[PDB]
Amino acid sequence: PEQLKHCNGILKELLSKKHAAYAWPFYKPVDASALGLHDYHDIIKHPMDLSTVKRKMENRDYRDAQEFAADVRLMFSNCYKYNPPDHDVVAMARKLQDVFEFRYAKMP
Ligand SMILES: COC(=O)C[C@@H]1N=C(c2c[nH]c3ccccc23)c2cc(OC)ccc2-n2c(C)nnc21
């Protein structure tokens, strides 16, 4: 209960303007067609993004904090999985994950 309330606050920061410089690629699902990706959905089997997490939050689909954090980390993993480590989107994912993992750790 109060746990899921904290998760809601974390999500607002990930979407806040303070982190928009490196968090924008994760606002909406990967549009493989718009990006020219031909193997994204064959390799990434369970896509995830901040709007989908926000939706599941609003529909009260998360039962605890652990279920919420599982989706957020999966979002970063898909980015790490599909892209080589030298790509900048991986660096943006690492920057945003360090923000998430820090705030998530400071949860009561
Ligand atoms: C060429 O390879 C790709 O298109 C992969 C794709 N690239 C970026 C991106 C974002 N800054 C970048 C800098 C250099 C290279 C790629 C990028 C991107 C952009 C988006 O804007 C709507 C939305 C999703 C992503 N996104 C995610 C999340 N995970 N992978 C990708």
Resolution in A: 3.2
Burial track 46-56 (b if 16+ CB lie within 10 A, e otherwise)? eebbbeebbee
Residue 99, phi then psi, degrees to nearest 5: -65, -45
* 35 Cβ inside 6 Å of ligand 1: yes
Domain that holds residue 50: 1-106
CATH number where 81 lies: 1.20.920.10
In short, whether 87's Cβ falls inside 6 Å of ligand 1 is: yes
What is the rounded CA–CA span in Å between residue 58 and residue 79? 24
Number of C-beta neighbours around residue 42 at 10 A: 9
Cα distance between residue 51 and residue 56, in whole Å: 9
22, 26, 30: residue to mutate for ligand 1 pocket, most atoms within 8 A of CB: 30
Total domains present in the chain: 1
In angstroms, the first-to-last Cα distance of the chain is: 12
Per-residue CA distances from 60 to 16, 31, 41, 95 (Å): 21, 26, 27, 28
